[PDB]
Design a protein around this ligand. Structure first.
Ligand SMILES: COC(c1ccccc1)(c1ccccc1)[C@H](Oc1nc(C)cc(C)n1)C(=O)O
Lengths: 225, 120, 212, 392
C-alpha cells in the first residue's frame, strides 16, 4: 500500500538549520501532491507548507514563511523540507501527508495516508546529570494510612526519561508525572507511591532515575519523616 | 444572594418516590452548575448529585447511582431531583447549591438553607 | 481565514452510548469537510470525507451529516475503541486549509474527593540552597480542581507549576501534584506552608500544613 | 313536496349523463393508447380513472332511469333479477373508491417526482391493479346487505329492494355508516392531498431558490474580480466562485458535469496565478471564463428551469380534479349530515326548512352523478396537452 516515511530530525540550537526527508513508496510522487502539517506538544494541528511534484507549485503558511523551503525529487521519490533560523517555540512533531489531483474522486478523499511524525526540539542548555531529592511524607500526615512517598527530580536533559520506584521493585499503585517545563532549560518530574503500610522493610524506597545521553543513573534514599 | 428555597418531598414510605426542587431568581442557572449536598446527622454536607450546563452531562455520586436523577430548566432557573426506591438510610436534610465559577473548578461559596427529607 | 469551531471540548461517555460532535464554519464551504481520529503518540487517520461518506476500513457506526454551514459527527454505539481525539478539517483548496481545536472523549464514573497526602521537602534541598514545597491530590474525578498556594498563612504567586496525569486503567481516575521550588534566602524566612484545595466533590475547602 | 317534474328532470339529466360520458370516456381511452407519446405513469392513472366510469354508467344509468319512470324495479321475479339490486350499489361504491384512490396516488407521485428533479412502469401497473382490487374489497359490504321485501301496491305481492339488514354486522353497519362514508370518501382525499401539495410548493421554491443564488454569486464575483485592485480581492472572490461551482455541480444531473469540472479547473488556475502575485495573469485567467460560462452553464440553467415549468403544468392539471370532485360531492354530504344531528325531529321550521333540505338532497344526487362525465371536459379545458389530441 501507499507508504510515506519521515526522517531527519534532531535537537538544534536556536537560529540553526535542519533538513528533513519524506520518502514515498508504493506510488509515484508525480501523481499525488505532498504537504507538511505541524503539531505543537499538547496543541492543535496546523498547516505549514505544500509542494506539487508535477506542476512544481509550492505554498507556505504565514507561520513558516521566509524560513522554510520545500522541494522534492521525483527520481529519488523523496520530498525535503529545510528549516532555517529555528526558534524555541517552533519545537513540534511534523508529519508529511499526501493529496490527490483535482479531476475525479482522488481529490475528494483529502489526506488518506500520513507519515509517522518527526520530533524537532530547539534548546540551548547542555546535557547534565539529574539531581534527586527525597520527598517523604511527614510523620503526622497520614499516620498509619497511605503515605505519599516521593522522589523529586530536577536539572536534567534526556528525552526518554525512565524513573523507577524502589529501583523498579515498587510498581503497585505508583503515579509518575510528565516532565514540567521548569525554568532555565531542563525539566522536572516526580513519582509517588501510595504504599499504605509504613513497615521498615519497605521503608527503603531507593528511587532510581536514568539519563541515557549523559550515562547518569541517580538513586535517592528517602528518609521516613 | 442567590435564594434557592427548595420545596418538595419531606416524607415517604419505603420503596416510594419523591421529587425535590430548588429554583433561583436574579441569578440564572443557564451559565452555572447546580449541586446537591446531603447533610447527614453529625456529618458535613456530602455530595450527592451535580448538573452541568445545558448539554454537558450530569455526574452523580455512588450513593444515588441510578436511584436519583437531576434535570434543570433554564427558562425559570429550576432544578429537580427524582429519588426512587428509597432505603431508610436516606433520612437527612438536603441542600441545593450553585457554583461561583464558569469552569466548574471548586467554587461553593453559597450554601442551601436545608430541607429535611426523611424516609421510613 | 475560514475558521472552524468545534462545540464540545471534552465529552464523558460510557460504553454503549451515542455521541455527537458539531463543527461550524465561517464561510460557505461545500461538503469539503473531513474528520480524523488520533490516539496519543500516533498520526491521525481518516474517518469521513465529503461530509457524508464512509472510508474503507471504518465501522458503520460512524456517521456524518451536513446541514448548511454546520456539520455533525455521530457515533451510535460507543465501543471501547472510540476513546481518542477527533479532529475536523476543511479543504476547499490546497493553500487555504485550517483545522479545529479538537475534542477529547473519556469515560464517565462517580465522584471521588481528592485525598490530600501532603509531604514536606527534604533537608538536602535546603542544604543545597533550594527547597521545594510540594503538595499532592490523589485519585479524583472529574478533572477540574483548584489549588491556591499559601506560605506563612499568606497567599503567594509565582513558582506554581503543576501537572496532571492521564486516566489510569485501574479505576479511571486522575492525580495532580503542585511544586513550589524556592531559594534558601526566602525559605529560611518562610515558616508555615499550607496548600488550600477545592474540588467540586468536596463541600468545604480543606488545607493541611506543616511547619519548618 | 316535490313534483313529478323532478322525476322528468332526473330522467333528462340521466340521459344527458349517459350520452355525454359514454362518448367522452370512449375518446379518452382511445387517445390514451392511440398515441405513442401520451403513454406514462400519470396518463396511465388517468386512463384507469376514466375507464372506471364506463362500466358504471352504461349499466347503472339505464336501470336507474327505467326504475325512476316505471311501475317498479325491472324483472321483479327472477333469479338474476334480484342480482340487479345487489349489483346496483356495488358498482357505484367501487367507482367512487377507485376515483378517490387514483387522485391520492396522483398526489403522491406528483410530490415524489418534484423531489427527484431530473411507458407504464411496473410500479404504476402494480398500484393500479392494487387500487382496483381494494375498491371492490371495500365495497362488497353494500353488495352483501341488499335484499328485496314484499309490498302490496294494487293488491299485488310485489318486490322492492331496500336495506333490510339480516346479520348482526349488517345492523351494526346500518347503525353507523354515514360518518364512515363522510370520513373515508370526503376527508382523507381532502387531507393527504393538501399536505402533499404544501410539501411540493415548499420544496420547489427551495430547489430553485438556491440555483438562482449560485448563479448570482458567480456573476457578482466575476464583477468583483474584473475590478480587483490587489491579489487579496482576487483570492477572496475566487474562493466564493469555487464554493459556488462545487455546490452547483452536485445539483446538475448526469456533458454538463465536464463543463463544471473545466470551470473548477480554470478557477484553480486563476487562483494559482494570483498566489504568486501576478495580478494581471489572474485577471486574464478570470476573463477567460467567458468561453466556458456561455457554452455549458447557460444551456444547463435554461433546460433545468424550463424543465421545472413542465413539471408544474402537470401538477396543476392533476390538482384541478381534486377541487372539482370536492365541489361536486360536498352538497350531498351537506344535506346528509344536517339531517342527522340537527335533524327536523319536531322543529317548527318544517314548513320551510324541510322542503329546502329535500330539494338540496334531491339535486345533490344529480350533482354527484355529474362527476362521472365531467373529467373529459376539465382535462380538455385545462391540460392543454390532451387538448391537442382531442383537436386532432
Ligand atoms: C343516495 O343513494 C346513493 C346510492 C348508492 C348506491 C346504491 C343506491 C343509492 C346515491 C345514488 C346515486 C347518486 C348518489 C348517491 C348513496 O351513495 C352514496 N355514495 C357515496 C360515496 C356517499 C354517499 C353519502 N352516498 C347512498 O349510499 O345512499
Amino acid at each position: 500500500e501507499v507508504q510515506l516515511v519521515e526522517s531527519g530530525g534532531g535537537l538544534v540550537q536556536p537560529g540553526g538549520s535542519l533538513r528533513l526527508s519524506c520518502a514515498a513508496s508504493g506510488f509515484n510522487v508525480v501523481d499525488f501532491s505532498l504537504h507538511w502539517v505541524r503539531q505543537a506538544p499538547g496543541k492543535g494541528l496546523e498547516w505549514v507548507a505544500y509542494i506539487s511534484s508535477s506542476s512544481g507549485s509550492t505554498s507556505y503558511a504565514d507561520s513558516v514563511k521566509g524560513r522554510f523551503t520545500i522541494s522534492a525529487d521525483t527520481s529519488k521519490n523523496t520530498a525535503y523540507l529545510q528549516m532555517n533560523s529555528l526558534r524555541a517555540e517552533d519545537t513540534a512533531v511534523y508529519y508529511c501527508a499526501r493529496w490527490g489531483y483535482w479531476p475525479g474522486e482522488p481529490w475528494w478523499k483529502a489526506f488518506d495516508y500520513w507519515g509517522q511524525g518527526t520530533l524537532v526540539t530547539v534548546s540551548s542548555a547542555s546535557t547534565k546529570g539529574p539531581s534527586v531529592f527525597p520527598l517523604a511524607p511527614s510523620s503526622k500526615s497520614t499516620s498509619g494510612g497511605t503515605a505519599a512517598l516521593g522522589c523529586l527530580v530536577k536539572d536534567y536533559f534526556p528525552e526518554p526519561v525512565t524513573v523507577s520506584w524502589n529501583s523498579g521493585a515498587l510498581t503497585s499503585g505508583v503515579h509518575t508525572f510528565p516532565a514540567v517545563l521548569q525554568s532555565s532549560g531542563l525539566y522536572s518530574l516526580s513519582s509517588v507511591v501510595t504504599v499504605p503500610s509504613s513497615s521498615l522493610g519497605t521503608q527503603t524506597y531507593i528511587c532510581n532515575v536514568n539519563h541515557k545521553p549523559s550515562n547518569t543513573k541517580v538513586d535517592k534514599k528517602v528518609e521516613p519523616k | 444572594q442567590v435564594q434557592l428555597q427548595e420545596s418538595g418531598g419531606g416524607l415517604v414510605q419505603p420503596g416510594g418516590s419523591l421529587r425535590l426542587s430548588c429554583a433561583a431568581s436574579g441569578r440564572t442557572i443557564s451559565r452555572y452548575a447546580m449541586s446537591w449536598f446531603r447533610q447527614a446527622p453529625g456529618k458535613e454536607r456530602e455530595f450527592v448529585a451535580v448538573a452541568r450546563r445545558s448539554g454537558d452531562g450530569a455526574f452523580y455520586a455512588d450513593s444515588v447511582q441510578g436511584r436519583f436523577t437531576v434535570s434543570r430548566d433554564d427558562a425559570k432557573n429550576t432544578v429537580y431531583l427524582q429519588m426512587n426506591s428509597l432505603k431508610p438510610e436516606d433520612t437527612a436534610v438536603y441542600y441545593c447549591a450553585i457554583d461561583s465559577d464558569t469552569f466548574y473548578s471548586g467554587s461553593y461559596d453559597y450554601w442551601g438553607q436545608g430541607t429535611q427529607v426523611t424516609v421510613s | 481565514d475560514i475558521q472552524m469551531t468545534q462545540s464540545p471540548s471534552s465529552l464523558s461517555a460510557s460504553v454503549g452510548d451515542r455521541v455527537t460532535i458539531t463543527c461550524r464554519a465561517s464561510q460557505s464551504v461545500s461538503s469539503a469537510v473531513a474528520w480524523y481520529q488520533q490516539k496519543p503518540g500516533k498520526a491521525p487517520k481518516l474517518l469521513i470525507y465529503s461530509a457524508s461518506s464512509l472510508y474503507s476500513g471504518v465501522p458503520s457506526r460512524f456517521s456524518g451529516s451536513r446541514s448548511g454551514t454546520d456539520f455533525t459527527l455521530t457515533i451510535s454505539s460507543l465501543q471501547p475503541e472510540d476513546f481518542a481525539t477527533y479532529y475536523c478539517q476543511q479543504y476547499l483548496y490546497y493553500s487555504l486549509v485550517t483545522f479545529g481545536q479538537g475534542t477529547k472523549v473519556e469515560i464517565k464514573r462517580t465522584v471521588a474527593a481528592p485525598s490530600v497526602f501532603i509531604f514536606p521537602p527534604s533537608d538536602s534541598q535546603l542544604k543545597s540552597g533550594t527547597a521545594s514545597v510540594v503538595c499532592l491530590l490523589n485519585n479524583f474525578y472529574p478533572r477540574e480542581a483548584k489549588v491556591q498556594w499559601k506560605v506563612d498563612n499568606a497567599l503567594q504567586s509565582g513558582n506554581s507549576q503543576e501537572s496532571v496525569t492521564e486516566q489510569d486503567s485501574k479505576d479511571s481516575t486522575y492525580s495532580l501534584s503542585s511544586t513550589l521550588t524556592l531559594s534558601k534566602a526566602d525559605y529560611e524566612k518562610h515558616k508555615v506552608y499550607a496548600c488550600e484545595v477545592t474540588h467540586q466533590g468536596l463541600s468545604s475547602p480543606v488545607t493541611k500544613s506543616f511547619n519548618r | 313536496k316535490i313534483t313529478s317534474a323532478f322525476k322528468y328532470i332526473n330522467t333528462v339529466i340521466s340521459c344527458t349523463i349517459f350520452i355525454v360520458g359514454m362518448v367522452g370516456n370512449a375518446t379518452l381511452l382511445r387517445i390514451i393508447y392511440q398515441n405513442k407519446c401520451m403513454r406514462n405513469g400519470p396518463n396511465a392513472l388517468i386512463a384507469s380513472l376514466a375507464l372506471g366510469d364506463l362500466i358504471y354508467v352504461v349499466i347503472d344509468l339505464p336501470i336507474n332511469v327505467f326504475k325512476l319512470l316505471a311501475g317498479r324495479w325491472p324483472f321483479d321475479h327472477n333469479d338474476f333479477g334480484v342480482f340487479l339490486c345487489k349489483l346496483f350499489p356495488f358498482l357505484q361504491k367501487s367507482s367512487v373508491g377507485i376515483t378517490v384512490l387514483n387522485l391520492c396516488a396522483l398526489s403522491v407521485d406528483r410530490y415524489r417526482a418534484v423531489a427527484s428533479w431530473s411507458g407504464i412502469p411496473l410500479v404504476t401497473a402494480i398500484e393500479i391493479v392494487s387500487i382496483w382490487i381494494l375498491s371492490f374489497i371495500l365495497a362488497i359490504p353494500e353488495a352483501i346487505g341488499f335484499v328485496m321485501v314484499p309490498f302490496e301496491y294494487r293488491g299485488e305481492q310485489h318486490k322492492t329492494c331496500m336495506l333490510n339488514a339480516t346479520s348482526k354486522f349488517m345492523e351494526f353497519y346500518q347503525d353507523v355508516k354515514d360518518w364512515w362514508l363522510f370520513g373515508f370518501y370526503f376527508c382523507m382525499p381532502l387531507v393527504c392531498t393538501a399536505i402533499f401539495y404544501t410539501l411540493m410548493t415548499c420544496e420547489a421554491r427551495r430547489q430553485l431558490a438556491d440555483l438562482e443564488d449560485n448563479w448570482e454569486t458567480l456573476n457578482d464575483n466575476l464583477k468583483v474580480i474584473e475590478k480587483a485592485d490587489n491579489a487579496a480581492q482576487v483570492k477572496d472572490a475566487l474562493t466564493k466562485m469555487r464554493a459556488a461551482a462545487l455546490d452547483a455541480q452536485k445539483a446538475t444531473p448526469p456533458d454538463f458535469r465536464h463543463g463544471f469540472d473545466i470551470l473548477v479547473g480554470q478557477i484553480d488556475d486563476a487562483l494559482k496565478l494570483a498566489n504568486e502575485g501576478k495580478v494581471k495573469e489572474a485577471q486574464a485567467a478570470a476573463e477567460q471564463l467567458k468561453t466556458t460560462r456561455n457554452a455549458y452553464i447557460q444551456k444547463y440553467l435554461e433546460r433545468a428551469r424550463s424543465t421545472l415549468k413542465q413539471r408544474r403544468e402537470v401538477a396543476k392539471t392533476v390538482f384541478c380534479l381534486v377541487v372539482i370532485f370536492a365541489l361536486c360531492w360536498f352538497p350531498l354530504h351537506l344535506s346528509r349530515i344536517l339531517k342527522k344531528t340537527v335533524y327536523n325531529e319536531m322543529d317548527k321550521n318544517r314548513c320551510e326548512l324541510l322542503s329546502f333540505l329535500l330539494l338540496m338532497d334531491y339535486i345533490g344526487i344529480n350533482l354527484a352523478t355529474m362527476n362521472s362525465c365531467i373529467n373529459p371536459i376539465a382535462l380538455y379545458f385545462v391540460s392543454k396537452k390532451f387538448k391537442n389530441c382531442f383537436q386532432s
